[PDB]
Write an enzyme that holds these catalytic residues in place. Structure first.
Site, mmCIF file in Angstrom:
data_model
loop_
_atom_site.group_PDB
_atom_site.id
_atom_site.type_symbol
_atom_site.label_atom_id
_atom_site.label_comp_id
_atom_site.label_asym_id
_atom_site.label_seq_id
_atom_site.Cartn_x
_atom_site.Cartn_y
_atom_site.Cartn_z
ATOM 1 N N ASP A 472 -44.264 -8.928 -2.490
ATOM 2 C CA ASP A 472 -44.269 -8.533 -3.889
ATOM 3 C C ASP A 472 -45.053 -7.225 -4.001
ATOM 4 O O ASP A 472 -46.116 -7.098 -3.400
ATOM 5 C CB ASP A 472 -44.941 -9.649 -4.706
ATOM 6 C CG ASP A 472 -44.851 -9.435 -6.199
ATOM 7 O OD1 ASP A 472 -43.722 -9.450 -6.728
ATOM 8 O OD2 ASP A 472 -45.919 -9.303 -6.844
ATOM 9 N N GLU A 509 -40.740 -5.055 -2.096
ATOM 10 C CA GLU A 509 -40.468 -4.123 -3.182
ATOM 11 C C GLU A 509 -41.328 -2.897 -2.994
ATOM 12 O O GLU A 509 -42.528 -2.950 -3.284
ATOM 13 C CB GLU A 509 -40.921 -4.706 -4.512
ATOM 14 C CG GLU A 509 -40.354 -6.037 -4.897
ATOM 15 C CD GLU A 509 -40.916 -6.455 -6.230
ATOM 16 O OE1 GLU A 509 -42.116 -6.815 -6.287
ATOM 17 O OE2 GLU A 509 -40.150 -6.389 -7.212
#
Ligand SMILES: [Ca+2]
Ligand SMILES: [Ca+2]
Length: 883
Positions: A472, A509
């Site tokens: 993340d 990400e």
């Protein structure tokens, strides 16, 4: 409360940095208070309450390279030397301020010190942390270099009173104690006496162990468990490496993103104690597991599970949970705001959250276990991993190292910042916590944070045999942390650690924004910095080009697969010429993505000009292709965040379309991922038209809005307007759609979507040509045939070559086919694509499609005389040349 003003930095044992003017500072002083008794009253004018004071000498040349490499943003700061007779180890335990004094006299500035630099310089520690078990003893180690005292409190079980306190001893910032083997299975907490800047006091805090491997309910206490203990292992655990699904290459990966509670919350074929948790995966006889088995058999290789470690926001104690009545909610109108009102009323106390709220990284989430006390959370997590591996699926954890749920001295949900205030969290230049990730951004640039992240990864890999990690907000993590993690994981061996590390895959990400943007805090894990690392990043270019617009744009902005130019929705997006040019630009961006999103792949663009992937740009000026390898590209059109695939299509396409047409549009979007070079990523539910009633951020929207229905009777469309907090601004566009009966699919649509999705998965795994492993292979083999100013709008034709003829110039990869051609036709009508280069060849429709339950695709044709490929409207046709 905010952290106090702290504009100076203690960066090494001997150096303090502070951006103060030359003539503005005649001399600088450091003041210390053991009892945190310092104050500055304007009536008195001078700093009071200090135990010691030391003058600092200005350092003319400045800060050494090791500081500026570590903290680039303070490279301009003036440097001040701390004399070597100062007991730095004692001082970092005190309240500290630095003061500036004009060359004329009198205080000109006073501020607190940011300490991470000096704490690393003096106390960086690489020895054991947490609990270490030997034959005759158990030791505990805690890194707490600013603490004035540390003790451990042992408890009478998970709920009982404290029974015993034991003092720890400090050495170089590390507190430790060694006890007898009988300490095993006790519960404990550390009692940490430390200066907390937010309260301006030395407080006595109770904290869990950062290196906890298990916890009591809600992490109230740490369980002193030996993770290697035989009784914590499912049958055959130590032979799991022998049972793991084969993985020949990272280019063979497909990913399915799934929330653990979503998976079984509505599954009536699962027992009530397992529903919503780890154990529902070990239930091989359920509709949910049969669904995963179906995808896995078709070729799916990896399941990516949403956060499954100890997070805040869901009570581990199931008897505290609040629920809505689904039978009641089912009677409210489809476009009513009553369903969301009911959900929002209990959302803080219900069983539901995505889990992006980290408390302790190393421990499974208690709410997903059958019992949040004792061994069940460990055993059941392992049972889940084993069960998934057994049906042919490798397991990826969603890891969230970029921020913490809480900071400060108060609360069950703050651990790291309670123990070493101001260290684990990133701060701005005034000393306030950075919140760009959500709240309480971590600082991976700090030694012990880097250590904790890598240690946690190794914990999941070895102790739980996890097969992969999704990071993340990887852009908030330092590149050096990512690379060291990669080196550490990929070197694990079955003989020595029980797992084959060479098969562990990492992706994230790589979004570049806020305080980490443009390498401000160091080289961070942005998309561009991660090119050439072998670590995957999500390809947002292909997502936006296919769907249209951007998560931050107007919801009605159309794209390649949502009717731009071809099927205008009535939202004004320019004239015909503007929309057609926008379509062709998106087509170029998609084609780069289909070829692995490589920086150096050459495409004939819509202008007729040959361009490298990195030479093609987005609307906002970024290079579209950026990778060195297809394994660095995660291609997707949907995920847990933003609207589902079904919902985005329902919003962006013309209202006049039937659900039958939108069903084929859903299929086209998933086929573009499934047949792309690089790594296809699927949102759980893409394959069955999953809806969240158009919820764009369903993190706290409960089981109601996040329903997965494995009876296939419903797709969760039209279950009320989604929660106002994230959606209200868009309610006026949602209401008429949710209320319109022709927007809802029947069981037959859902099952048709599933059948076609499985078919396209089977096609991907029918030929190694869809899964080329290197940039060279893609550049040699992959061609696009519909290009230039005269390109047919709404059509992509992708050819993939294999060795053919006597003495070819390439290896033979495919024993069955010598050439593959995929036609993506998003036009409503049939197209005929003449490709003279492919005339006089033996093309047939792929056997999977010849035998398809879809009648339309069976109408596809190839004519050898002309190289004409004919493809029905809203269809993806794969043609093969058999050997
Ligand atoms: Ca599989
Ligand atoms: Ca909730």
């Amino acid at each position: 409360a905010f952290m106090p003003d702290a504009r100076a930095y203690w960066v090494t044992s001997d150096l303090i940095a502070w951006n103060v003017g030359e003539l503005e500072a005649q001399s600088v002083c450091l003041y210390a208070s053991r009892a945190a008794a310092m104050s500055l009253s304007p009536s008195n004018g001078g700093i009071q309450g200090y135990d010691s004071k030391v003058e600092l000498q200005p350092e003319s040349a400045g800060l050494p390279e090791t500081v500026t490499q570590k903290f680039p943003f303070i490279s301009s700061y003036r440097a001040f030397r701390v004399p070597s007779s100062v007991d730095v180890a004692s001082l970092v335990k005190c309240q500290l301020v630095v003061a500036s004094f004009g060359a004329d006299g009198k205080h000109v500035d006073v501020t607190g010190l940011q300490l991470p630099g000096v704490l690393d310089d003096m106390f960086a520690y690489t020895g054991p942390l947490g609990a270490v078990f030997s034959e005759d003893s158990v030791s505990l180690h805690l890194w707490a270099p600013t603490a004035q005292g540390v003790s451990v409190c042992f408890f009478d079980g998970p709920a009982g009173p404290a029974l015993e306190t034991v003092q720890l001893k400090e050495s170089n910032g590390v507190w430790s104690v060694t006890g007898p083997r009988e300490w095993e299975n006790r519960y404990y907490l550390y009692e940490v006496d430390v200066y907390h800047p937010t309260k301006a006091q030395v407080l006595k805090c109770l904290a869990g162990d950062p290196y906890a491997r298990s916890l009591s309910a809600n992490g109230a206490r740490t369980w002193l468990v030996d993770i290697n203990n035989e009784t914590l292992k499912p049958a055959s655990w130590d032979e799991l490496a022998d049972e793991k699904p084969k993985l020949d290459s990272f280019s063979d990966i497909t990913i399915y993103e799934l929330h653990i509670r979503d998976f079984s919350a509505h599954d009536g074929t699962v027992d009530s104690d397992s529903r919503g948790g780890f154990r529902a995966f070990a239930y091989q006889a359920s509709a949910g597991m049969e669904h995963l088995r179906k995808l896995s058999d078709a070729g799916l290789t990896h399941v990516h599970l949403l956060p499954s470690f100890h997070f805040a926001g869901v009570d581990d104690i199931k008897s505290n949970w609040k629920f809505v009545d689904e039978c009641e909610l089912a009677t409210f109108p489809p476009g009513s705001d009553m369903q969301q009102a009911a959900v929002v009323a209990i959302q803080e106390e219900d069983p539901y959250n995505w889990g992006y709220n980290p408390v302790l990284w190393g421990v499974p989430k208690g709410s997903y276990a059958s019992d949040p006390d004792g061994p069940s959370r460990i055993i059941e997590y392992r049972q889940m991993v084993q069960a998934l591996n057994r049906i042919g699926l490798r397991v990826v954890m969603d890891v969230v190292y970029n921020h913490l749920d809480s900071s400060g001295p108060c609360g069950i949900s703050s651990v790291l910042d309670k123990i070493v205030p101001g260290y684990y969290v990133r701060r701005d230049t005034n000393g306030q916590i950075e919140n760009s990730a959500a709240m309480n951004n971590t600082a991976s640039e700090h030694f012990m944070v880097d250590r904790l992240i890598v240690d946690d990864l190794l914990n999941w890999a070895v102790n739980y045999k996890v097969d992969g990690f999704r990071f993340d907000l990887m852009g908030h993590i330092m590149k050096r942390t990512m690379m060291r993690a990669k080196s550490a994981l990929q070197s694990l061996t079955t003989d020595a650690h029980g797992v084959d590390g060479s098969k562990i895959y990492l992706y994230g990400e790589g979004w570049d924004f806020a305080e980490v943007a443009r390498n401000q805090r160091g080289i961070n894990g942005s998309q561009l910095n991660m090119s050439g690392t072998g670590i995957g990043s999500f390809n947002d270019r292909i997502r936006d080009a296919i769907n249209g617009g951007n998560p931050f744009g107007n919801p009605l902005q159309q794209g390649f697969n949502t009717g731009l130019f071809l099927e205008p929705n009535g939202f004004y997006q320019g004239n015909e010429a503007d929309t057609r040019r926008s379509l062709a630009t998106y087509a170029d961006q998609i084609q780069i993505g289909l070829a692995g999103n490589l920086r150096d792949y050459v495409l004939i663009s819509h202008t007729g000009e040959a361009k490298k992937g990195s030479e093609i740009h987005t609307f906002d000026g970024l290079p579209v292709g950026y990778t060195a390898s297809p394994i660095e590209t995660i291609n997707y059109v949907s995920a847990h965040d933003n609207e589902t695939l079904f919902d985005v299509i329902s919003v962006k396409t013309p209202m006049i379309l039937s659900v039958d047409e939108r069903c084929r549009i859903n299929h086209l979007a998933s086929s573009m991922m499934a047949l792309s070079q690089g790594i296809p990523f699927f949102h759980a539910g893409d394959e069955i038209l999953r809806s969240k009633s158009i919820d764009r951020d369903s993190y706290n929207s409960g089981d109601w809005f996040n329903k997965l229905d494995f009876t296939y009777e419903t797709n969760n469309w039209g279950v009320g307007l989604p929660p106002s907090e994230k959606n209200e601004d868009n309610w006026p566009l949602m209401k008429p759609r949710l209320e319109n009966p022709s927007f809802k699919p029947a069981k037959g649509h859902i099952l048709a979507a599933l059948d076609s999705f499985v078919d396209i998965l089977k096609i991907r795994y029918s030929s190694p040509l869809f899964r080329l492993s290197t940039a060279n292979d893609i550049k040699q083999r992959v061609r696009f045939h519909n290009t230039g100013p005269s390109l047919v709008p709404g059509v992509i034709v992708m050819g993939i070559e294999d060795a053919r003829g006597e003495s070819p110039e390439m290896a033979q990869l495919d024993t069955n086919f010598s050439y593959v051609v995929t036609v993506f036709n998003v036009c409503p009508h049939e197209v005929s694509m003449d490709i003279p280069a492919l005339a006089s060849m033996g093309f047939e429709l792929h056997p999977v499609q010849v035998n398809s339950s879809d009648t339309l695709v069976r109408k596809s044709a190839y004519e050898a005389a002309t190289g004409r490929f004919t493809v029905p409207g809203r269809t993806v046709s794969v043609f093969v040349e058999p050997r």
